[PDB]
Design a protein around this motif. Structure first.
Motif, mmCIF file in Angstrom:
data_model
loop_
_atom_site.group_PDB
_atom_site.id
_atom_site.type_symbol
_atom_site.label_atom_id
_atom_site.label_comp_id
_atom_site.label_asym_id
_atom_site.label_seq_id
_atom_site.Cartn_x
_atom_site.Cartn_y
_atom_site.Cartn_z
ATOM 1 N N UNK A 1 0.727 -1.173 0.160
ATOM 2 C CA UNK A 1 -0.125 0.000 -0.027
ATOM 3 C C UNK A 1 0.764 1.346 0.155
ATOM 4 N N UNK A 2 0.808 2.104 -1.100
ATOM 5 C CA UNK A 2 1.339 3.400 -1.007
ATOM 6 C C UNK A 2 0.318 4.450 -0.837
ATOM 7 N N UNK A 3 1.041 5.544 -0.195
ATOM 8 C CA UNK A 3 0.369 6.982 -0.352
ATOM 9 C C UNK A 3 0.749 8.110 -1.220
ATOM 10 N N UNK A 4 -0.082 8.350 -2.036
ATOM 11 C CA UNK A 4 0.576 9.486 -2.970
ATOM 12 C C UNK A 4 0.012 10.934 -2.637
ATOM 13 N N UNK A 5 0.996 11.811 -2.269
ATOM 14 C CA UNK A 5 0.514 13.242 -1.996
ATOM 15 C C UNK A 5 0.511 14.150 -3.298
ATOM 16 N N UNK A 6 -0.838 14.600 -3.368
ATOM 17 C CA UNK A 6 -0.945 15.483 -4.574
ATOM 18 C C UNK A 6 -0.928 16.854 -3.974
ATOM 19 N N UNK A 7 -0.266 17.687 -4.911
ATOM 20 C CA UNK A 7 -0.297 19.312 -4.605
ATOM 21 C C UNK A 7 -1.053 19.762 -5.953
ATOM 22 N N UNK B 1 9.615 5.724 3.078
ATOM 23 C CA UNK B 1 10.736 5.857 2.075
ATOM 24 C C UNK B 1 9.901 6.344 0.686
ATOM 25 N N UNK B 2 10.694 6.848 -0.039
ATOM 26 C CA UNK B 2 10.502 7.451 -1.266
ATOM 27 C C UNK B 2 10.942 6.547 -2.668
ATOM 28 N N UNK B 3 10.049 6.494 -3.507
ATOM 29 C CA UNK B 3 10.446 6.165 -5.001
ATOM 30 C C UNK B 3 9.853 7.302 -5.745
ATOM 31 N N UNK B 4 10.581 7.170 -7.098
ATOM 32 C CA UNK B 4 10.066 8.068 -8.275
ATOM 33 C C UNK B 4 9.055 7.753 -8.737
ATOM 34 N N UNK B 5 8.253 8.564 -9.463
ATOM 35 C CA UNK B 5 7.144 8.244 -10.347
ATOM 36 C C UNK B 5 7.194 8.495 -11.815
ATOM 37 N N UNK B 6 6.982 7.555 -12.525
ATOM 38 C CA UNK B 6 7.167 7.605 -13.988
ATOM 39 C C UNK B 6 5.481 7.542 -14.666
ATOM 40 N N UNK B 7 5.557 7.667 -15.900
ATOM 41 C CA UNK B 7 4.253 7.850 -16.489
ATOM 42 C C UNK B 7 4.266 6.951 -17.899
ATOM 43 N N UNK B 8 3.123 6.143 -17.677
ATOM 44 C CA UNK B 8 2.915 4.947 -18.687
ATOM 45 C C UNK B 8 1.734 5.136 -19.380
ATOM 46 N N UNK B 9 2.034 4.934 -20.993
ATOM 47 C CA UNK B 9 1.314 5.300 -22.047
ATOM 48 C C UNK B 9 1.351 4.146 -23.023
ATOM 49 N N UNK B 10 0.425 4.313 -24.093
ATOM 50 C CA UNK B 10 0.526 3.257 -24.978
ATOM 51 C C UNK B 10 0.488 4.578 -26.318
ATOM 52 N N UNK B 11 0.746 3.751 -27.523
ATOM 53 C CA UNK B 11 0.853 4.705 -28.849
ATOM 54 C C UNK B 11 -0.624 5.058 -29.303
ATOM 55 N N UNK C 1 16.762 9.618 -5.457
ATOM 56 C CA UNK C 1 15.315 10.030 -4.688
ATOM 57 C C UNK C 1 14.969 11.184 -4.570
ATOM 58 N N UNK C 2 13.989 11.559 -4.114
ATOM 59 C CA UNK C 2 13.409 12.897 -4.248
ATOM 60 C C UNK C 2 13.358 13.564 -2.842
ATOM 61 N N UNK C 3 13.424 14.789 -2.657
ATOM 62 C CA UNK C 3 13.303 15.705 -1.332
ATOM 63 C C UNK C 3 12.654 16.696 -1.511
ATOM 64 N N UNK C 4 12.011 17.153 -0.314
ATOM 65 C CA UNK C 4 11.028 18.216 -0.483
ATOM 66 C C UNK C 4 11.375 18.834 0.854
ATOM 67 N N UNK C 5 11.214 20.289 1.105
ATOM 68 C CA UNK C 5 11.903 21.224 2.103
ATOM 69 C C UNK C 5 12.589 20.678 3.275
ATOM 70 N N UNK C 6 13.560 21.429 3.782
ATOM 71 C CA UNK C 6 14.299 21.079 4.887
ATOM 72 C C UNK C 6 13.858 21.094 6.153
ATOM 73 N N UNK D 1 4.386 13.049 -5.158
ATOM 74 C CA UNK D 1 5.470 12.570 -4.771
ATOM 75 C C UNK D 1 4.624 11.047 -4.159
ATOM 76 N N UNK D 2 5.528 9.925 -3.926
ATOM 77 C CA UNK D 2 4.880 8.874 -3.399
ATOM 78 C C UNK D 2 5.549 8.477 -2.299
ATOM 79 N N UNK D 3 4.935 7.848 -1.181
ATOM 80 C CA UNK D 3 5.631 7.621 -0.163
ATOM 81 C C UNK D 3 5.105 5.800 0.357
ATOM 82 N N UNK D 4 5.828 5.196 0.874
ATOM 83 C CA UNK D 4 5.359 4.067 1.665
ATOM 84 C C UNK D 4 5.955 4.062 2.917
ATOM 85 N N UNK D 5 5.265 3.832 4.082
ATOM 86 C CA UNK D 5 5.785 3.686 5.483
ATOM 87 C C UNK D 5 6.949 2.553 5.383
#
Lengths: 289, 270, 92
Positions: free
Chosen positions: A119-125, A180-190, A163-168, A137-141
C-alpha cells in the motif's frame, strides 16, 4: 530477505494522473481523498490503472473518513463491467503543505499497510500544478520496529540511487527517516499518445486562417518604433567600453542589460513573422480565385 | 573447437593437442600471479573504515574492488580479518560477497570446484544468498573452459524452471543462470538455450533477467532466426521491468558480429 | 599520481553521497587490480586483431547501475602481462 524488498516504482497511467488532479483541484482548499486501483507484478513494479475518490468529510482526511460502504459498492459497479482490479493504495491531498505525510496519514497508512503491504500513499499538490510542472510524490511507510532492526538499506538495494526531497528540516526528517520515497514515471501506449496530441479539425488547417490586417499593421508599426529607442541605447554603449577589464566596462557603460542582444532578438522575431504573413496572402489570393 | 578434432583424425602428438585445449596457459597465469602478488593493504583498510558494511551500497563497492584485487590468487585473509564487517552484509550485498569468491579463485581449475563446495547447495542453509551466489562464482572460475561446469548448472536450472515463486528457489535460480552463461560462453549449446528459455517463460521475478543475458552469452554471435524472433516478441509479452531490459540487451549479444545481417533487427528496435 | 590521489580523497570523505564513494572505491581497485599484475587489452599485440572475449566483458559491465552484481563481468577484460619464456623440449 528472499525477495527484492524495495518499494515499488509507481507507474501512474495517462488516465490516473489527470483524474487525481481534477479530483483534488475542485476541493481546494479542503483536503481530498480516494483510492488508487492497480495491479501488482514484479517485486517493485506497480502500474496504477485507475482511481476513484472516497467522498468528502467535515473533518477532512481521517482514518474515520474511510467508509466501507462507498468503497465496496463503487467496487461492485466496476465488477459488473470487469474493470476492477485490486486496491494498490490510496491518494490524498495536502495543498496547504509540501509533499510529506502529516501526523494523521501515517496511522492511516499503517492500517492500509496491514491490509496490503504494498500500500502506497501519494500526496498530490493541486495548488503547485498551476506551474508547468506537476508536484506529486509517493511514500510508503517503513515501520518503527523496522528501523530498530536497521532494515532500511534493504529497501534501497538494486535501485539507481536517485530519490526525491522536499523542503528541509521538518519535511525532510519525516521523508527519509520514517517512510521511503520512490520516483514516479508515466505510462502510456501509442494509441493514447495520438489521442492527446490531436487538436481541432481546423488546427491542421489554421495556416490558411489569416488575421485581420489592422492587427498586422499594428505589428509592423510597433516593431520599427521600438527598435529606434534600443538603437539609441546601443549608440551610448559603444562610445566608451574600450579600456581594460571587460566586466568593469560592461558595468560602467551600460553593457549589462545588453542592448546589443535585445536589438537583434526583436529584429529576428518580427522578421520571421513577416515572411509567413507574405506567404499566407500570396497563397490565399491565388489559390481561392 | 573445430581445429583440434581434425588434428585428432589426422594423427598428431598429444603435446600439441594439450596446448590447443588451453589448459597449460591457465596454469601459467596462476603461477605468475603467485610470484608477483603485491597487494597494498592500506587501500582495503581505508575503504573498509569509511564505506560501512551496514549500508548496502557501501559494502558492495568494497566487494567489487576486493575481488578484482584478489583475482586469480586464493586470498581469503581479508574475509577472515573483517568477518564482523562482512557479517553486516545482507540481501543482495551478501550474494555479491559470495560471488566475489569466484573472482578470487578464478583459474586454478583443478581446485575450482573443490573451493566453492562448502557454499554450493546441499552444504549451506543459513541464507539463500550464499546458495545462489556460489553458483554464479562457479561460472566465473570456469569461464571459457566450463564445458563440464555447464552440465552441473543445467541440472539445477531444469529442476527450478518449473517453480520460481518461492523465495529460496528464486535467488538460487538467479546465480545458476548467470553461471551457465559464463560456463557455456561461446559454445552455443542448444541444451542451454532450452533450459534458460523455460526460465524466461516462467516469468520469474528476478531470474528472467539472468536468463536473457545468459542465453546471449551462450549463443554469442550465432544470430539464429528462431532465437531472435522468439526473444523479440517476448519482451512485448512480458510486463516485468527487469526482463524487458534483459532481452533488449541480450538481442545485442546473440547478434554480435552480424554487421549487415543484423541490420533489420536494429531498425525495428530503434 | 594526481588521479590516483583524487580517488582516495573521496574514499576518505564522508560528506559526499554514496554514489561518488561507490565509484571512487571501485576505480581505485581497478587501477591496482590483480595485485598490480593485469592490464586491459582490447586488441592483442600477438597478431593485431580484436579479442572476442574483451568486448563481452565490457558491455556487461556498463549495466552495473541497474543491477550491481554485473560489475564482476569486468574481470573478462583483465589479462596478465608477462613474458613467459618456456624451454621447448619438455615444456618447462
Amino acid at each position: 530477505t528472499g525477495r527484492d524488498d524495495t518499494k515499488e516504482t509507481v507507474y501512474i497511467s495517462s488516465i490516473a494522473l489527470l483524474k487525481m488532479l481534477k479530483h483534488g483541484r475542485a476541493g481546494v482548499p479542503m483536503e481530498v481523498m480516494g483510492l488508487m486501483l492497480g495491479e501488482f507484478v514484479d517485486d517493485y513494479t506497480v502500474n496504477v490503472v485507475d482511481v476513484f475518490a472516497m467522498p468528502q468529510s467535515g473533518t477532512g482526511v481521517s482514518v474515520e473518513a474511510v467508509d466501507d460502504v462507498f468503497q465496496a459498492k463503487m467496487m461492485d459497479m466496476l465488477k459488473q463491467t470487469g474493470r476492477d482490479q485490486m486496491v494498490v493504495g490510496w491518494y490524498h491531498s495536502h495543498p496547504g503543505f509540501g509533499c510529506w505525510l502529516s501526523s494523521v496519514d501515517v496511522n492511516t497508512q499503517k492500517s492500509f499497510e496491514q491490509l496490503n503491504s504494498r500500500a502506497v500513499a501519494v500526496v498530490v499538490d493541486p495548488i503547485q500544478s498551476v506551474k508547468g510542472k506537476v508536484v506529486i510524490d509517493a511514500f510508503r511507510l517503513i515501520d518503527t520496529g523496522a528501523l530498530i532492526n536497521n532494515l532500511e538499506p534493504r529497501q534501497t538495494t538494486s535501485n539507481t540511487g536517485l530519490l526525491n526531497k522536499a523542503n528541509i528540516q521538518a519535511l525532510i526528517h519525516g521523508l527519509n527517516r520514517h517512510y521511503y520515497s520512490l520516483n514516479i514515471d508515466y505510462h502510456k501506449t501509442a494509441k493514447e499518445t495520438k489521442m492527446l496530441m490531436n487538436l481541432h479539425k481546423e488546427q491542421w488547417q489554421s495556416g490558411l486562417k489569416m488575421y485581420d490586417y489592422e492587427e498586422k499593421e499594428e505589428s509592423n508599426l510597433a516593431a520599427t518604433k521600438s527598435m529606434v529607442k534600443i538603437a539609441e541605447q546601443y549608440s551610448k554603449r559603444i562610445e566608451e567600453e574600450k579600456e581594460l577589464t571587460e566586466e568593469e566596462l560592461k558595468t560602467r557603460y551600460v553593457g549589462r542589460q545588453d542592448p546589443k542582444k535585445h536589438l537583434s532578438e526583436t529584429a529576428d522575431e518580427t522578421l520571421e513573422n513577416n515572411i509567413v504573413s507574405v506567404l499566407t496572402a500570396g497563397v490565399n489570393s491565388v489559390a481561392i480565385k | 573447437e573445430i581445429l583440434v578434432t581434425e588434428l585428432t583424425a589426422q594423427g598428431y602428438d598429444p603435446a600439441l593437442l594439450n596446448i590447443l585445449s588451453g589448459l597449460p596457459t591457465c596454469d601459467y597465469y596462476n603461477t605468475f600471479l603467485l610470484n608477483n602478488k603485491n597487494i597494498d593493504i592500506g587501500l582495503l583498510n581505508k575503504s573498509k573504515s569509511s564505506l560501512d558494511g551496514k549500508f548496502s551500497l557501501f559494502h558492495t563497492a568494497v566487494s567489487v574492488a576486493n575481488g578484482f584485487m584478489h583475482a586469480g590468487t586464493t586470498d581469503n585473509s581479508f574475509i577472515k580479518a573483517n568477518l564482523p564487517w562482512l557479517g553486516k552484509a545482507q540481501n543482495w550485498a551478501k550474494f555479491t560477497a559470495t560471488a566475489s569468491l569466484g573472482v578470487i579463485h578464478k583459474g586454478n581449475l583443478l581446485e575450482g570446484k573443490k573451493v566453492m563446495a562448502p557454499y554450493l547447495p546441499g552444504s549451506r542453509a543459513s541464507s539463500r544468498f550464499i546458495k545462489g551466489g556460489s553458483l554464479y562464482g562457479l561460472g566465473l572460475i570456469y569461464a571459457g573452459f566450463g564445458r563440464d561446469t555447464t552440465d552441473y548448472l543445467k541440472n539445477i536450472i531444469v529442476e527450478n524452471s518449473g517453480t520460481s515463486g518461492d523465495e529460496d528457489v528464486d535467488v538460487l535460480l538467479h546465480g545458476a543462470s548467470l553461471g551457465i552463461g559464463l560456463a557455456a560462453m561461446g559454445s552455443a549449446n542448444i541444451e542451454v538455450y532450452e533450459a534458460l528459455k523455460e526460465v524466461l517463460y516462467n516469468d520469474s521475478a528476478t531470474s528472467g533477467e539472468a536468463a536473457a543475458l545468459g542465453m546471449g552469452l551462450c549463443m554469442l554471435g550465432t544470430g539464429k532466426p528462431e532465437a531472435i524472433h522468439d526473444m523479440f516478441t517476448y519482451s512485448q509479452e512480458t510486463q516485468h521491468g527487469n526482463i524487458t531490459r534483459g532481452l533488449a540487451v541480450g538481442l545485442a549479444l546473440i547478434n554480435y558480429g552480424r554487421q549487415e545481417l543484423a541490420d533489420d533487427l536494429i531498425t525495428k528496435m530503434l | 599520481a594526481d588521479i590516483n590521489k583524487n580517488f582516495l580523497s573521496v574514499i576518505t570523505n564522508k560528506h559526499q553521497e554514496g554514489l561518488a564513494k561507490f565509484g571512487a572505491c571501485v576505480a581505485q581497485g581497478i587501477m591496482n587490480a590483480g595485485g598490480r599484475n593485469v592490464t586491459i587489452q582490447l586488441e592483442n599485440a600477438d597478431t593485431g586483431t580484436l579479442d572476442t572475449k574483451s568486448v563481452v566483458g565490457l558491455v556487461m559491465f556498463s549495466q552495473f547501475w541497474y543491477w550491481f552484481p554485473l560489475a564482476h563481468f569486468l574481470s573478462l577484460s583483465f589479462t596478465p602481462t608477462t613474458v613467459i619464456g618456456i624451454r621447448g623440449s619438455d615444456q618447462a
